[PDB]
């Protein structure tokens, strides 16, 4: 009962306060037993270390399947919120990235390739977490599916760059040649998002105003930037927004999974 153990050392203080908890935590981590250290820190009243450990578990789970990494990252974000109640929203980054890693794909499962494209373009914001090859392959896939070849070319170029990088045996070259022999690299992407201040039209996946540099928030389920709060649902747990016309089928927040 380390939380109360440390809190108990209050009268006159003591010559020693805790510091065996850190020893047991080092023992647990060195022994490779993972979740026991998380529980030890969570009972210890130190949710930041538990959040870090859950982030490590998410990193390790990412290589096998994205859903497990998503679960561990939303868990770590919740632990950080517990610490705050006990860069601010950066604790949620690892969530949303992997959330997009599913969400875009889900919209491809529904043959709704437009919102899938916008989510794929939103995937670029987390290049540190997800592999750039993964995200840009998804971007090129979505762009090819909607027959918009401008973003398709802009993603294929990065794919070819990475393929030339890893050599220092090329299917990206064959794909680019076969897709640009017949279809020209035309960028058919309309701007249908007005800044609240300037009023100029930005792209759907804009993270900020193109000129006013005022920050934007993105739709969780469709990916498009949000500018009007008349149709902006919010989740109280994760403090994220969504659009009513596409979130009405969601009994719980798709990011943190809370009704």
């Amino acid at each position: 009962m380390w939380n109360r153990a440390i809190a108990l050392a209050k009268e006159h203080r003591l010559e020693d306060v805790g510091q065996l908890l850190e020893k047991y935590a080092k023992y647990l981590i060195h022994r490779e037993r993972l979740t026991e250290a998380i529980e030890l820190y969570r009972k210890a009243g130190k949710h930041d270390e538990a959040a870090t450990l859950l982030a490590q578990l998410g990193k390790r789970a990412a290589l096998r399947d994205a859903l497990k990494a998503k679960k561990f990252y939303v868990l770590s974000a919740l632990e950080v919120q517990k610490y705050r109640t006990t860069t601010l929203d950066a604790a949620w980054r690892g969530a949303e990235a992997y959330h997009f890693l599913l969400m875009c794909q889900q919209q491809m499962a529904d043959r709704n390739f437009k919102a899938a494209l916008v989510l794929a373009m939103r995937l670029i914001e987390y290049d540190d977490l997800v592999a750039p090859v993964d995200g840009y392959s998804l971007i090129a896939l979505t762009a090819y599916l909607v027959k918009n070849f401008g973003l398709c070319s802009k993603a294929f170029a990065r794919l070819e760059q990475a393929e030339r990088n890893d050599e220092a045996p090329r299917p990206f070259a064959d794909l680019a040649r076969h897709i640009f022999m017949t279809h020209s690299p035309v960028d058919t992407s309309v701007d249908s998002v007005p800044c609240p201040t300037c009023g100029s039209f930005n792209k759907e996946w804009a993270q900020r105003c193109i000129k006013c540099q005022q920050p934007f928030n993105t739709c969780i389920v469709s990916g498009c930037a949000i500018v009007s709060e008349d149709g902006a649902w919010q989740c109280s747990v994760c403090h994220r927004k969504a659009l009513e016309a596409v979130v009405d089928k969601y009994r719980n927040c798709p990011l943190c999974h809370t009704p």
Binding site: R33, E36, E39, L40
Partner: protein
């Protein structure tokens, strides 16, 4: 009961004796003796056992009461704590509760069913949750069937026994092949070390005041020690087959030797 090579053409029991004999297809006639093995539980004076391989006979000893629970399927493991009973069947786990009617006749009611095929070496019922244990893992489930907690030990678990506590925070007692006797609180995820033995622990019980401990090793050697920061040994006696502590008296031990 037994397996032959080819088709077993006939099998007949010896009348009025625990023995049968079967003749197979490959010209082999074999006779098998049968020794009945009994599963049993005892808490305070309540004592439950398996009769006819399908019924649970529960007997309050000091009051001389008895009733029969027809589970209708083969019973594998039984556990008992306070007014709670757990029966591990072939495909379910049934949790009964004992109660008295207006006429002061004790009755049993089945209060929980867990339709999960569970594999474990040890089973322990408690006030609101059941606990199963296999090899290294101890998993505690609620009465519906959802998991509640799990512990991974250092050695395979040989003994597991509820020694009582507050509701939802009941103590357990676990013995490991490494000689570790530990308290597994059902609310905590971290066992607390009581005894570090040099042999696998076959049986161990806690005192009524829980300030003293009796440990039976793999060599049938019993050690009773005073628990604390270091378990000060009180006495040791060899060739012990079983031990029990006095529920009502602190310093009163009863052990049966070989």
């Amino acid at each position: 009961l037994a397996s032959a090579d080819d088709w077993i053409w006939s099998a007949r029991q010896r009348p009025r004796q625990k023995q049968f004999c079967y003749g197979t297809n490959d010209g082999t006639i074999s006779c098998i003796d049968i020794t009945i093995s009994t599963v049993h539980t005892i808490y305070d004076d309540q004592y439950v056992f398996r009769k006819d391989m399908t019924n649970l006979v529960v007997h309050q000893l000091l009051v001389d009461r008895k009733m029969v629970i027809p589970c209708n399927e083969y019973v594998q493991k039984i556990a008992t704590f306070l007014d709670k009973l757990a029966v591990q069947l072939q495909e379910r786990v049934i949790v009964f509760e004992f109660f008295y009617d207006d006429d002061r006749t004790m009755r049993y009611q089945d209060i929980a069913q867990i339709r999960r095929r569970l594999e474990c070496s040890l089973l322990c019922v408690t006030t609101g949750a059941i606990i199963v244990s296999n090899d290294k893992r101890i998993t505690m489930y609620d009465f519906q069937g959802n998991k509640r907690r799990e512990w991974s030990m250092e050695s395979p678990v040989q003994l597991m026994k509820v020694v009582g506590g507050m509701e939802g925070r009941e103590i357990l007692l676990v013995g490991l092949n490494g000689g570790q006797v530990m308290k597994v609180f059902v609310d905590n995820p971290f066992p607390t070390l009581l005894h570090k033995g040099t042999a696998p622990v076959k049986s161990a019980e806690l005192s009524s005041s829980r300030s003293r401990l009796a440990v039976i090793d793999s060599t049938n050697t019993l050690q009773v020690l005073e628990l604390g920061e270091k378990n000060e040994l009180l006495f040791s006696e060899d060739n012990v087959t079983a031990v029990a502590f006095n529920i009502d008296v602190d310093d009163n031990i009863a052990f049966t030797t070989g």
